[PDB]
């Protein structure tokens, strides 16, 4: 079903951490604001409402999360390990890492910036967008990637995870190393 004004009141602690673990909710109110962390793991939610503002971290592991609307703000990280998301929207305010391990993700917006590690492990993504800048480590193990973008910035160590890299970026400033 949906989340009402009083439905969410039963899933909030003293610090405004909303816990929806395995709750049979399919959507959240439009323009939703959560003071603390949001947990929607293992939920049938297919799309996040537009204007969602999270003061903490996002956790949607093993959930049905497939669509995210632009303009969403996350102060912490977005943990989506094992979700059903297919495409990442542009303009998401994210202050942590994007964990997309075990996801059907295919495309990423151009000039994407991740303030932490990016994990696209076991994803059918074909090509990292040009201008992609990562301030942490890069995980591409088990993915369909075989060609890197011409320019990318990975402040951490790039981990290949087994896939063969045929083309390397021309302009790459790496603070670490490259591991298979």
């Amino acid at each position: 079903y949906e989340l009402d004004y009083y439905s969410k009141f039963g899933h909030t602690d003293n610090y405004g951490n909303l816990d929806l673990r395995n709750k049979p909710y399919t959507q959240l109110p439009s323009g939703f604001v959560v003071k603390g962390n949001l947990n929607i793991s293992q939920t049938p939610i297919k799309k996040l409402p537009k204007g969602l503002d999270v003061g903490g971290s996002l956790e949607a592991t093993n959930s049905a999360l497939k669509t995210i609307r632009s303009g969403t703000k996350i102060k912490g990280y977005a943990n989506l390990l094992g979700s059903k998301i297919e495409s990442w929207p542009r303009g998401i305010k994210l202050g942590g890492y994007l964990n997309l391990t075990d996801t059907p993700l295919k495309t990423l917006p151009a000039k994407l910036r991740v303030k932490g590690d990016l994990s696209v492990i076991r994803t059918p993504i074909s090509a990292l967008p040009e201008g992609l800048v990562v301030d942490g480590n890069l995980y591409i193990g088990g993915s369909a990637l075989q060609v890197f973008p011409d320019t990318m910035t990975v402040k951490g160590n790039i981990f290949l995870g087994g896939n063969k890299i045929t083309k390397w970026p021309s302009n790459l400033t790496l603070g670490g190393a490259v591991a298979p």
């Binding site: 009141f9 039963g10 602690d13 003293n14 610090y15 903490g56």
Partner: protein, 130 residues
């Protein structure tokens, strides 16, 4: 081989000790609106497991919080009150925690009896024949 009994009773006694400490924390934190980092305490419960395929030892496989909703109280003048003046408190129920205290202690002591009785049986086997 009664030495296996020692492993099973020892694993059971360890499991009961984990359950007792979980009950001890619930009774002590049944009135705490705050927490260490940022999340209101929720009644914890150890998970016992039997890896049946001789003897099957019982192993604790992690602590899982109770899924009961937090008891909301109307404390509008409290510093931590929400927009509606409600503060949330742990879902610890006194009656079930007392039963755990009784059940864990009685289960702990009967496993000592089995190990002590099994210890004697090994000794009588050593004295067999002489």
């Amino acid at each position: 081989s009664l030495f296996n009994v020692f492993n099973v009773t020892g694993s059971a006694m360890s499991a009961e000790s984990v359950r007792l400490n979980t009950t001890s924390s619930n009774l002590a934190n049944a009135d705490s609106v705050s927490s260490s980092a940022k999340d209101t305490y929720k009644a914890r419960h150890a998970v016992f497991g039997a890896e049946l395929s001789d003897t099957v030892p019982v192993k604790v496989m992690g602590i899982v919080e109770s899924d009961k909703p937090l008891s909301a109280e109307y404390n509008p003048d409290h510093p931590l009150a929400n927009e509606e003046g409600y503060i949330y408190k742990p879902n610890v129920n006194v009656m079930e925690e007392m039963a755990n205290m009784i059940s864990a202690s009685r289960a702990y002591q009967t496993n000592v009896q089995v190990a002590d009785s099994s210890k004697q049986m090994l000794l009588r086997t050593l004295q067999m024949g002489q």
